[PDB]
């Protein structure tokens, strides 16, 4: 049951260094970070997924210093997920985008190709254009990406927490993403917590239904 | 399995308006809203679930016009969410979630609960003086809440849709969302989908893990 799930996950704050993802494990993350929607199917993101020593590493360079508190998070998991967004939405992501849809059989005719491209044009160009925030609207599919993976996670039996206690411009250069087209947004750490995850045994806390929710 | 789920879900295109969540689906999907993580816990959003006639036509008056084309799945699904996100991070909305954590038992001390309310003040206080984005940092908590709530609709094997495009003003209009401190940003219709839902049996379309993946 998904609400059993959503009821018990929670954000592990100390992780078992021993424990790793199986290699099917490691593969189904990676499906979970691919399939998440996106607004036109924009999918405006790229994802680092260090698993190597070295990598994650690399990755807990942006917790150095005033961040520290979620520096052995990074080192610690498992598996290390640095959600990016792109910079700026280009004409030429926006065709790869629509040329997957149709290798993938979504299209009956050079037709509706067409009409594809037409509608997720007049869509981002009213982002580019006129409201120039496509930066925001970017950041956040990236975060609709990461709702989808924390809950996935959870599902999966494994341990995770998102981070956005981090220097990103620290990462983003220690990645070299500015000159990509990318920036990081969110860091989440996934494998298993440890005795020391004092936030395993507390219990979870939300707003009542009552505040949060009107019903019409 | 949640990857077969993630595989499953579609972005539904049409309902059927003679199918209606049971009571006890109801009250799942008011939960999966409650439950969704976010930063500091700061649950910075409001929700409108409209499942009466006249609510949904209420929601689906910001689809007439330009957004025809999602009026229909407004009006036709069986509830209707609509994310709100507060236009402001104030202090008392702060004190709030810390009584909360204390009334749920997640401090064990006073002087805990203070250092708690200490912390989450310097982290909003971040995105409120230095960056002066508090108001895009809600929103992508919001959005972060969307992608949970994306997946476990599907997981509860119901249909859904998330729509950015409907008209936010004529919808914070018709709910007075302005003045109560919120604003509407993704609107979700869930229920089940009807013969018009040429999407149901088109293929999933993602880029390849060798575009959007970085292994270390
Ligand atoms: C975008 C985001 C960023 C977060 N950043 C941090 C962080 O930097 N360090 C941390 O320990 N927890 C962080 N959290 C975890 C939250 O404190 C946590 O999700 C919230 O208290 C709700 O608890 P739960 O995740 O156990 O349900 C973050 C959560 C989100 C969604
Ligand atoms: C934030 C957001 C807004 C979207 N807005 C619309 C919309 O206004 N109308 C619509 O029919 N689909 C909309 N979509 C659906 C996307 O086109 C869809 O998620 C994407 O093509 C991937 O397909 P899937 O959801 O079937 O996996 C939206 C999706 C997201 C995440
Ligand atoms: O008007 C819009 O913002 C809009 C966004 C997304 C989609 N879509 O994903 O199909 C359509 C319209
Ligand atoms: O942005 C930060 O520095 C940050 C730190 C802690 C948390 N948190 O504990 O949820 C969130 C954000």
């Not at 996950?9 to 099917?24: I, P, V, Y």
């Not at 509608?119 to 160009?125: C, E, S, V």
């Not at 927490?161 to 500015?178: M, N, R, T, W, Y």
Request: glycine letters at 6%; hydrophobic letters at 40%; aromatic letters at 8%.
């Amino acid at each position: 049951d998904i609400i059993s799930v959503a009821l018990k996950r929670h954000s592990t704050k100390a992780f078992d260094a021993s424990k790793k993802l199986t290699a099917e494990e490691a593969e189904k993350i990676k499906t979970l970070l691919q399939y998440s929607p996106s607004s036109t199917n924009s999918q405006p993101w790229h994802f680092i997924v260090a698993s190597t020593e070295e990598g994650k590493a690399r990755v807990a360079k942006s917790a150095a210093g005033t961040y520290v508190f979620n520096e052995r998070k990074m080192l610690d998991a498992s598996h290390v997920v640095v959600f990016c967004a792109k910079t700026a939405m280009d004409d030429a992501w926006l065709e790869r985008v629509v040329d997957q849809e149709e290798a993938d059989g979504r299209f009956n005719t050079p037709e509706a190709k067409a009409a594809n491209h037409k509608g997720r044009t007049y869509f981002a160009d009213m982002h580019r254009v006129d409201l120039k925030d496509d930066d925001q609207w970017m950041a956040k599919q990236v975060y609709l990406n990461v709702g989808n993976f924390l809950l996935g996670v959870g599902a999966m039996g494994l341990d995770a927490v998102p981070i956005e206690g981090f220097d990103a411009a620290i990462l983003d250069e220690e990645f070299g993403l500015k000159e990509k087209g990318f920036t990081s947004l969110v860091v989440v750490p996934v494998g298993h917590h440890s005795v020391e995850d004092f936030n395993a045994t507390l219990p979870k806390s939300r707003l009542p239904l009552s505040t949060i929710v009107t019903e019409c």
